[PDB]
Amino acid sequence: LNPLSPDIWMYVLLACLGVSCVLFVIARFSPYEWYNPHPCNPDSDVVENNF
Amino acid sequence: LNPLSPDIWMYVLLACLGVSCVLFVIARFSPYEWYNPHPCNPDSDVVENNFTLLNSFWFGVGALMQQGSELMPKALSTRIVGGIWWFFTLIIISSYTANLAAFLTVERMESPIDSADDLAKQTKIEYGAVEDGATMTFFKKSKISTYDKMWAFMSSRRQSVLVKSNEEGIQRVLTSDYAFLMESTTIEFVTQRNCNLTQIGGLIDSKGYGVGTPMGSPYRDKITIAILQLQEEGKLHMMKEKWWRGNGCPEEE
Amino acid sequence: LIDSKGYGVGTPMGSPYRDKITIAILQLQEEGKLHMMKEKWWRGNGCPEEESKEASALGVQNIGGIFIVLAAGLVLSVFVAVGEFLYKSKKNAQLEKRSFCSAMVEELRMSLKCQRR
Amino acid sequence: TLLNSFWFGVGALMQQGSELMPKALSTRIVGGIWWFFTLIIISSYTANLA
Amino acid sequence: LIDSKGYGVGTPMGSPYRDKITIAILQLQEEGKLHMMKEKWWRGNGCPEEE
Ligand SMILES: CCCCCCCC/C=C\CCCCCCCC(=O)O[C@@H](COC(=O)CCCCCCCCCCCCCCC)COP(=O)([O-])OCC[N+](C)(C)C
Ligand SMILES: CCCCCCCC/C=C\CCCCCCCC(=O)O[C@@H](COC(=O)CCCCCCCCCCCCCCC)COP(=O)([O-])OCC[N+](C)(C)C
Ligand SMILES: CCCCCCCC/C=C\CCCCCCCC(=O)O[C@@H](COC(=O)CCCCCCCCCCCCCCC)COP(=O)([O-])OCC[N+](C)(C)C
Ligand SMILES: CCCCCCCC/C=C\CCCCCCCC(=O)O[C@@H](COC(=O)CCCCCCCCCCCCCCC)COP(=O)([O-])OCC[N+](C)(C)C
Ligand SMILES: CCCCCCCC/C=C\CCCCCCCC(=O)O[C@@H](COC(=O)CCCCCCCCCCCCCCC)COP(=O)([O-])OCC[N+](C)(C)C
Ligand SMILES: *[C@@H]1O[C@H](CO)[C@@H](O[C@@H]2O[C@H](CO)[C@@H](O)[C@H](O)[C@H]2NC(C)=O)[C@H](O)[C@H]1NC(C)=O
Ligand SMILES: O=S1(=O)NCN(C2CC2)c2ccc(F)cc21
Ligand SMILES: O=S1(=O)NCN(C2CC2)c2ccc(F)cc21
Ligand SMILES: O=S1(=O)NCN(C2CC2)c2ccc(F)cc21
Ligand SMILES: C=C(C)[C@H]1CN[C@H](C(=O)O)[C@H]1CC(=O)O
Ligand SMILES: *[C@@H]1O[C@H](CO)[C@@H](O)[C@H](O)[C@H]1NC(C)=O
């Protein structure tokens, strides 16, 4: 746990909470991650989100 | 196998079987892992668990070898186990490859003596010369204080370390732990006929041979012109390579 | 060094040899003989041991702690394994009552080992 | 197939994933001892690469 | 080395100073002064560049 200083081990933990949060926020208002499930699916107007 | 200790190679095998039995028990017990892979009829009650005991073993082996498997936890109770086994096998693989760099390139072998002054400090390796030679006579008359330390070791134990010939000086290097002090023209002959001995230092001094004559002899000039004739012609290099031959040893490593 | 003091060649009180050695010790010092004699006798087997080399395969004293943070990760995961059993019965609380009789069903059906439904 | 089996071996050699994974435990031992092989080859390679 | 030869203090043919320097050069050599004077003048900026 020594080859990174103990503020780097915190800054890579606040980056996992920061990137994964903004990956969730963008996946809410990105209108191309509203894909079609059920790989046959005659359209049925139901789309979902992996994130 | 070297960069990890032989108990650590067992503690990884006991953790790869240890986690992969805990991950089976949690996945069988957790209700959120049971999923229905039936896109046609979602209420047809085809709930299923991928984590059988042969699949739970394969997640542990697959994440340990850093190739990764097709199995991903999706219940959170199995997703801490899958997330903490990825950290364990990040530190094991990194500590192995950062210790494997040390166990491949370190040196050939360092000799305990590398010179004459290192041989004077180390009083474990006893050392001597011929007790009738000009090798003894140099260290006895020297005062350079590296060779005052070397003669004080030899003059204390003239019965022990000083020998009678070159042959009895090499046999005590081959058998005992000894550092016999030859002249550089019969170290070159010994280190071709016997490829397990070496020359440690450079040269302590510079000397040279010569056809001795009595005091005021008329031949001391007719020989030294005839030696220079044998040296300009190249005879004294033809006769040296003929006798100090190239019997063959490995290079230096 | 706690203090500093030095080695004096003692003479009786009133010796004329005091100054003749005082000048003489300075004569060996300005020439360099007092450093020659010290580095001949305070020399010897200089301690090799401190340096490094060649070794230290990683043992339990070296790596060590990822066998601890693993076991702390599996103990914490069992604690959230019972926490998803209790909340699944709370999502089964709008069906039977809230509790054990609905909970003992989930206790059984995991133990039948691929009777899936 | 023989094209799909050779892309497992090349895939597991260069440390990348492949779309096919061995089921049927006799093929998981092949796929598990080729993973320990390519771990040691590459860890020995990049150790001397400096 | 292509050959091997050495530096002789020249004297005319029949000089009595020949033997008195022949013994003398051996006297500087057995004591170590010929190695002191060589390692004072053939010393200098030893080439760092190779390392
Ligand atoms: C945003 C959405 C949500 C994201 C959430 C998750 C993200 C988490 C993000 C960050 C997490 C926490 C960050 C830790 C700080 C790192 C910096 C650091 O430590 O270096 C130094 C700080 O000194 C500087 O270098 C300051 C320079 C500021 C320039 C602008 C920065 C913004 C870049 C964005 C541009 C945007 C526009 C671009 C448009 C394309 C430390 O100083 P020092 O120790 O003395 O070292 C000497 C430095 N020296 C040699 C330079 C003198
Ligand atoms: C239910 C799931 C359980 C896990 C199952 C997983 C299956 C496999 C799991 C593990 C397999 C391997 C076993 C791990 C330890 C091996 C090391 C060993 O035995 O020797 C060491 C003993 O070690 C100690 O004494 C340290 C004490 C920690 C013990 C475990 C604490 C974990 C729980 C606490 C956290 C709870 C927190 C809760 C959450 C926040 C030797 O001692 P040493 O001093 O290291 O040696 C120095 C050498 N020297 C003297 C020469 C210098
Ligand atoms: C990457 C994404 C973010 C993850 C978030 C968590 C990261 C932040 C985590 C930790 C932040 C560290 C801050 C320091 C404070 C505690 C340190 C300490 O006191 O050590 C003490 C205990 O420590 C341990 O033994 C291990 C405790 C944590 C292990 C489990 C982590 C849970 C990760 C999975 C769940 C993640 C949670 C989220 C999901 C549910 C030392 O005591 P000892 O070792 O027993 O004794 C010395 C050993 N000896 C006796 C031989 C000498
Ligand atoms: C210290 C602890 C000691 C023990 C205490 C007890 C444990 C307490 C902890 C947890 C409580 C246990 C019950 C939780 C309910 C499970 C359902 C669920 O996960 O929601 C959904 C996940 O998708 C989401 O929307 C998740 C929302 C965020 C939660 C996770 C945060 C991640 C950060 C990480 C940091 C750690 C997070 C910490 C917790 C937030 C899935 O729901 P579903 O059933 O699949 O339905 C979907 C419909 N479908 C099936 C067709 C797709
Ligand atoms: C970091 C990566 C972690 C990877 C996981 C750790 C796995 C554990 C790996 C090894 C643990 C066991 C060895 C302990 C190490 C001590 C040395 C030793 O005992 O060697 C002994 C020999 O025995 C062997 O060398 C063969 C050991 C098995 C080979 C590894 C199989 C990997 C399986 C893959 C698993 C998945 C496959 C799925 C199912 C197949 C003898 O000592 P020696 O020094 O060799 O001297 C003799 C040699 N000589 C001829 C030169 C004279
Ligand atoms: C390999 O090492 C050994 C021991 O370090 C050496 O061989 C022996 O060394 C001891 C000195 O303690 C002698 O008494 C023995 O006579 C030596 N053995 C033989 C057969 O002569 C030596 O350094 C090496 N041995 C080799 C290369 O054979
Ligand atoms: O004993 S000598 O006559 N004089 C000393 N030297 C050279 C000073 C090294 C040498 C060098 C090589 C010799 F063959 C002889 C001598
Ligand atoms: O005992 S002394 O003669 N006088 C005191 N000192 C100096 C005060 C340090 C020293 C310092 C070095 C000495 F060798 C002797 C002495
Ligand atoms: O020219 S010399 O006097 N005679 C020839 N040799 C030896 C044959 C190498 C040497 C070797 C070293 C010298 F210094 C001089 C001479
Ligand atoms: C073989 C012996 C004893 C001779 C050979 N040359 C030196 C000489 O003739 O003076 C000695 C070497 C030595 O003492 O190591
Ligand atoms: C050096 O000694 C070893 C064992 O004492 C033996 O192989 C032989 O005498 C020597 N080695 C070689 C390569 O001649």
UniProtKB/Swiss-Prot annotation, chain B:
Localization, UniProt: Cell membrane; Postsynaptic cell membrane
Expressed in which tissues: Highest expression is found in the olfactory lobe, piriform cortex, dentate gyrus, hippocampus, granular cell layer of the cerebellum, and in caudate-putamen.
Glycan attachment sites: 196
Binding site for L-glutamate: 134-135, 183
Segments on the Extracellular side according to the record's topology features: 105-253
Superkingdom of origin organism: Eukaryota
Posttranslational modification: Sumoylation mediates kainate receptor-mediated endocytosis and regulates synaptic transmission. Sumoylation is enhanced by PIAS3 and desumoylated by SENP1. Ubiquitinated. Ubiquitination regulates the GRIK2 levels at the synapse by leading kainate receptor degradation through proteasome.
Disulfide bonds: 195-249
Transmembrane segments: 7-27, 84-104
Residues in the Cytoplasmic compartment per record: 28-83
Assembly notes: Homotetramer and heterotetramer with GRIK5. Tetramers may be formed by the dimerization of dimers. Assembles into a kainate-gated homomeric channel that does not bind AMPA. Can form functional heteromeric receptors with GRIK4 and GRIK5. Can form functional heteromeric receptors with GRIK3. Interacts with DLG4. Interacts with NETO2. Interacts (via C-terminus) with KLHL17 (via kelch repeats); the interaction targets GRIK2 for degradation via ubiquitin-proteasome pathway.
Family recorded in the similarity comment: Belongs to the glutamate-gated ion channel (TC 1.A.10.1) family. GRIK2 subfamily.
Function statement: Ionotropic glutamate receptor that functions as a cation-permeable ligand-gated ion channel, gated by L-glutamate and the glutamatergic agonist kainic acid. L-glutamate acts as an excitatory neurotransmitter at many synapses in the central nervous system. Binding of the excitatory neurotransmitter L-glutamate induces a conformation change, leading to the opening of the cation channel, and thereby converts the chemical signal to an electrical impulse. The receptor then desensitizes rapidly and enters a transient inactive state, characterized by the presence of bound agonist.
Additional facts recorded: The postsynaptic actions of Glu are mediated by a variety of receptors that are named according to their selective agonists. This receptor binds domoate > kainate > quisqualate > glutamate. It does not bind AMPA without coexpression with GRIK5.
Protein name per UniProt: Glutamate receptor ionotropic, kainate 2
Chain's gene name: Grik2
Residues of the full protein shown: 556 to 808 of 908
From Swiss-Prot, chain D:
Effect on the protein upon substituting residue 15 to R: In RNA edited version
Location within or outside the cell: Cell membrane; Postsynaptic cell membrane
Tissues/organs with expression: Highest expression is found in the olfactory lobe, piriform cortex, dentate gyrus, hippocampus, granular cell layer of the cerebellum, and in caudate-putamen.
Domain of life: Eukaryota
Residue intervals passing through the bilayer: 33-50
Post-translational modification note: Sumoylation mediates kainate receptor-mediated endocytosis and regulates synaptic transmission. Sumoylation is enhanced by PIAS3 and desumoylated by SENP1.
Misc: The postsynaptic actions of Glu are mediated by a variety of receptors that are named according to their selective agonists. This receptor binds domoate > kainate > quisqualate > glutamate. It does not bind AMPA without coexpression with GRIK5.
Family from the record: Belongs to the glutamate-gated ion channel (TC 1.A.10.1) family. GRIK2 subfamily.
Described function: Ionotropic glutamate receptor that functions as a cation-permeable ligand-gated ion channel, gated by L-glutamate and the glutamatergic agonist kainic acid. L-glutamate acts as an excitatory neurotransmitter at many synapses in the central nervous system. Binding of the excitatory neurotransmitter L-glutamate induces a conformation change, leading to the opening of the cation channel, and thereby converts the chemical signal to an electrical impulse. The receptor then desensitizes rapidly and enters a transient inactive state, characterized by the presence of bound agonist. Independent of its ionotropic glutamate receptor activity, acts as a thermoreceptor conferring sensitivity to cold temperatures. Functions in dorsal root ganglion neurons.
The protein's assembly and partners: Homotetramer and heterotetramer with GRIK5. Tetramers may be formed by the dimerization of dimers. Assembles into a kainate-gated homomeric channel that does not bind AMPA. Can form functional heteromeric receptors with GRIK4 and GRIK5. Can form functional heteromeric receptors with GRIK3. Interacts with DLG4. Interacts with NETO2. Interacts (via C-terminus) with KLHL17 (via kelch repeats); the interaction targets GRIK2 for degradation via ubiquitin-proteasome pathway.
The protein's name: Glutamate receptor ionotropic, kainate 2
Gene giving rise to this polypeptide: Grik2
Parent sequence residues shown: 607 to 656 of 908
